[PDB]
């Protein structure tokens, strides 16, 4: 393999922020400057350093819990939720010392499937749920009867609608191409006299054959639709507690850990589904050459004769299947190499109802959660978080990662870039294949940060990344250069 691995670098440290009046600590951070790749050594150090303080500036951290303080979690809950027969504090605190309890739910009621999974924010750049942001075990009274098939469900207070919206697509293509050729050319010449004679022969064949079969079949099954409320949200206490630990001073490292722990954006509208993509791709070739010749003289006499015969046959075939919702018995049989018999497909879709993936989703930046009814100095925490969110996008966006071989895809989890390898190539950089060449898909370098104010510009290049080497695909997905007003 043509490698010398890239070990991690974080920057030299920032200056310290001055001591925070409310967190009573000070912070220093580094940018990730070069990710770990080719199994080069990590330097992660959990991306931060922090110290205690002795300053005495005034602090207004006492935003009033008007209802009841959840003793362990530091949540507040409105007084109608105490002794509702439910855990609104997270640690059952609200139901202590109940002189009576009043129940509401008349029947058992399932959580809608995956509704606690939707409760977590996404890192939009790895496209991953990171950790818990809204309390999808919170029911605010609630207990309104909802049904899907004949099963009955409880809706989390945070969610506007979970409804089947039950839609399905299948898209199929099959393609064949074939081409054949055969050429035969001959010569013969003779002489005789009474003594002498002569003869000559050639026979030939050249032949070729080609085929492709391509098949793609995709199904998208969309048997729930989730929308989160716009605001008045009730937060998961583990998120709420890192938010109450953010400085009002600006120093990017502590804000970076919230995006690591709780995602960059919160999921506000999503279609919830199963997908069953199947692709089968085949290229087949055959060739032959045959050639045969003679020469003769007679006077005494001589003969020459030759044969040359040749054949080749090949197939390259690739198959990929992706399935993204259902139960493990169905999921494995669908995942089998054979085109699924419609019974499997039925039992798979029936289980997608009980365990969906997100198909398509619209997300909002996490600072819209940060709110004056929930945090002190909230608007400073918002402005800080907005700036940190922009700086974080510049860190998590994959562009730092050196290009994969074999058209591999980087996703840059944690602080390591790992090249996902397609079918037909292997190894750390996706180098190792039997194949001659592969089309490459384009992506830019990291964009230049800004030019000056009074009209501001950002610029991008593809110098190694570009499609033309070994005849690649599309170069682009957006604008090769970018400009805006300063305000």
């Amino acid at each position: 393999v043509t490698l010398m691995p890239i070990d991690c670098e974080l920057s030299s440290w920032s200056s310290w922020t001055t001591c925070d009046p409310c967190q009573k600590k000070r912070y220093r951070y580094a940018y990730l400057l070069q990710p770990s790749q080719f199994h080069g050594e990590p330097c992660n150090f959990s991306d931060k350093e922090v110290e205690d303080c002795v300053t005495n500036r005034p602090c207004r951290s006492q935003v009033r819990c008007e209802g009841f303080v959840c003793a362990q979690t530091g949540r507040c809950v409105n007084r109608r939720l105490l002794c509702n027969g439910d855990n609104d504090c997270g640690d059952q605190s609200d139901e202590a010392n109940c002189r009576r309890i009043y129940k509401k739910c008349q029947h058992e009621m399932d959580q809608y499937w995956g509704i606690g999974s939707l409760a977590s924010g996404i890192n939009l750049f790895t496209n991953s749920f990171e950790g818990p942001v809204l309390d999808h075990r919170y029911y605010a009274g609630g207990c309104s009867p909802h049904y899907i098939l004949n099963t009955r469900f409880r809706k989390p207070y945070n969610v506007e609608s979970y409804t089947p919206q039950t839609q399905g697509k299948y898209e199929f293509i099959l393609k064949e191409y074939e081409s054949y050729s055969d050429f035969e050319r001959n010569v013969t010449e003779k002489m005789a006299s009474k003594d002498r004679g002569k003869h000559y022969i050639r026979r030939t064949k050249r032949f070729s054959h080609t085929k492709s079969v391509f098949l793609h079949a995709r199904s998208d099954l969309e048997v729930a639709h989730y929308k989160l409320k716009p605001r008045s949200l009730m937060l998961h206490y583990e998120f709420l507690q890192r938010v109450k630990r953010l400085p009002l001073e600006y120093s990017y490292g502590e804000y970076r850990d919230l995006f690591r722990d709780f995602g960059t954006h919160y999921i506000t509208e999503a279609v919830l589904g199963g997908i069953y993509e199947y692709t089968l791709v085949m290229n087949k070739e055959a060739m032959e050459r045959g050639d045969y010749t003679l020469n003769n003289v007679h006077a005494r006499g001589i003969l020459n004769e030759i044969k040359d015969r040749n054949k080749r046959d090949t197939m390259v075939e690739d198959l990929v299947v992706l399935v993204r919702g259902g139960a493990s018995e169905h999921i494995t049989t669908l995942a089998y190499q054979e085109l699924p018999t419609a019974d499997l497909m039925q039992e798979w879709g029936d289980a997608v109802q009980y365990n969906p993936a997100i198909i398509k989703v619209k997300v909002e930046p996490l600072y819209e959660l940060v709110t004056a009814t929930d945090f002190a100095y909230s608007s400073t925490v918002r402005q800080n978080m907005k700036q940190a969110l922009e700086e974080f996008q510049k860190e998590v966006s994959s562009c730092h990662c050196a290009p994969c071989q074999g058209n591999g895809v980087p996703v840059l989890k944690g602080s390591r870039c790992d090249c996902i390898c397609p079918v037909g190539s292997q190894g750390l950089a996706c180098e190792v294949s039997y194949r001659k060449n592969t089309p490459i898909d384009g992506k830019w370098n990291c964009w230049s940060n800004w030019s000056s104010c009074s009209g501001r510009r950002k610029t991008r290049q593809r110098q190694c990344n570009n499609p033309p080497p070994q005849n690649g695909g599309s170069p682009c997905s957006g604008p090769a250069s970018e400009t805006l007003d300063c305000s």
Binding site: G131, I306, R309, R312, L319, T332, A335
Partner: protein, 482 residues
């Protein structure tokens, strides 16, 4: 084939004893794992680490070491006050429920709650003692929905074939930040075939005669099949960690001064790494590769006649199931079919494996705990690990034939060969034309240094690869802060 390099195991001479620490009641000392055996030669009678009883030079420190809140006197755990009489067992002594209403134990611990809490050893690929506390809840009633719960039952008394309410919920341990229950699978399949033949003649006659003929026939098959399934994925927390009680005491028992032995022992017992995040899955890989060839030649002249033929067939076949039941993983081990996949998948409902994960070196655990910073200890733990990943490393386990895995079992190396008996010369069925890679020789120690220069070094392997074999990711030098 090359001759064996078997040698008897050596530990070092002992170090001098550590002094009789209060509360620990122990002296310790160590030997430096000087040279655990190559693939042959008899084992060391001894071991790396020692404990011996001794009375201390001063009286043991009180539970004021925890500060303003309760500590279970016969064990490690310092506790937040609300845990005393919460109705759940917070420490190994159980005194947090002595001399006094959580119902959350209604749900069983999340599948993988154990193996994700256990440490890990990048030198041996083994687990270690609990790093996180796999069963600590911190008073949280954090339930997680089981996206695989769906299983059939029949009721003879009312004529229903229907799906059971069992396993629907799990209690999440406080040490898991989230554990998600989304269903996925992904399969990737290749087949490539190549097939060739060539046939040639020439003749001359004059009045002498000569005739020549050549034949070749060839075939190749490759396939790779990969599948992954996931039932859930998870990420451990990165702040306010509650350690295992065994980890916690085994940490407090470490010296403030740098002495290698106790930090090496905590590394060895609690692992080189801790799992920061993972995915819970069943993986099936299957790989099948074939070569064949056949050749002939003829020659006649005047007279005399001669003929020869040579032919080959070789097959490599692998089937490997991670996750599932013992029964059905035997089914899917033995056979690939629409039979063996479906029931294997049903068994992943009940018995998943952690299929893929991400990790940090063990010393990072401490900074994320409720204990407050331990910087002197944390640096001693790192300083020991920076020797340990040279000293305990499978890099020292030497030549493995036929692509065998070098692993250090405690104080003694193995080369797990994929065919034949282990160690040198693992093959007698394969010819000396067999293909095997070059793979790493170890790190050096940290070399002698100058104000802007320090080095540590590697070799890609000691020999060249066997025949057309592959090679390492490619390095010779690495550098350090001096």
């Amino acid at each position: 084939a090359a001759t064996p390099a078997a040698v008897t195991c050596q530990l070092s001479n002992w170090s001098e004893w550590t002094d009789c620490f209060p509360c620990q009641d122990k002296k310790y000392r160590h030997r430096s794992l000087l040279q655990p055996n190559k693939f042959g030669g008899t084992i060391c009678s001894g071991d790396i680490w020692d404990q011996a009883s001794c009375s201390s030079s001063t009286t043991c420190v009180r539970q004021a070491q925890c500060g303003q809140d309760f500590q279970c006197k016969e064990t490690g755990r310092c506790l937040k006050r609300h845990l005393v009489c919460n109705g759940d067992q917070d420490c190994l002594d159980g005194s947090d429920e002595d001399d006094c209403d959580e119902d959350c134990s209604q749900y069983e611990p999340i599948p993988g709650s154990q193996k994700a809490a256990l440490g890990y050893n990048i030198l041996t690929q083994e687990d270690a003692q609990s790093v996180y506390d796999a069963s600590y809840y911190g008073g949280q009633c954090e339930t997680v929905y089981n996206g695989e719960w769906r299983e059939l039952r029949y009721d003879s008394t009312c004529e229903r074939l229907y799906y059971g309410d069992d396993e629907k919920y799990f209690r999440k341990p406080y040490n898991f930040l989230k554990y998600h229950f989304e269903a996925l699978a992904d399969t990737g399949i290749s087949s490539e075939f190549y097939d060739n033949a060539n046939d040639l003649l020439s003749k001359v006659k004059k009045d002498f005669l000569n005739e020549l003929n050549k034949y070749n026939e060839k075939k190749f098959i490759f396939t790779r099949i990969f599948t992954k399934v996931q039932t859930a994925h998870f990420k451990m927390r990165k702040d306010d960690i509650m350690l295992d009680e065994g980890m916690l005491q085994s940490l407090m028992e470490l010296p403030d001064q740098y002495n290698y032995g106790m930090y090496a022992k905590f590394i060895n017992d609690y692992g080189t790494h801790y799992i920061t995040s993972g995915s819970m899955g069943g993986i099936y890989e299957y790989i099948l590769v074939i070569d064949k060839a056949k050749m002939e030649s003829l020659g006649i002249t005047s007279g005399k006649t001669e003929r020869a033929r040579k032919a080959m067939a070789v097959e490599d076949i692998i089937s490997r199931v991670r996750g599932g039941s013992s029964g059905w993983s035997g089914g899917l081990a033995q056979n690939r079919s629409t039979i063996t996949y479906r029931s294997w998948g049903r068994s992943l409902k009940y018995n998943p494996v952690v299929i893929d994960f991400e990790m940090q070196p063990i010393h990072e655990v401490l900074r994320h705990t409720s204990l407050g910073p331990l910087e002197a200890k944390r640096q001693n733990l790192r300083r020991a690990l920076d020797q340990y990943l040279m000293e305990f490393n499978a890099c020292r386990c030497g030549p493995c034939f036929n692509n065998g895995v070098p692993i250090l079992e405690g104080t003694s190396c193995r080369c797990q060969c994929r065919l034949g008996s282990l160690g040198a010369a693992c093959e007698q069925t394969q010819t000396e034309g067999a293909k095997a890679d070059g793979s790493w020789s170890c790190w050096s120690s940290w070399s002698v240094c100058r104000a802007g220069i320090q080095e540590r070094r590697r070799e890609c392997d000691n020999p060249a690869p066997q025949n057309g074999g592959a090679s390492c990711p490619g390095r010779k030098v690495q550098t350090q802060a001096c």
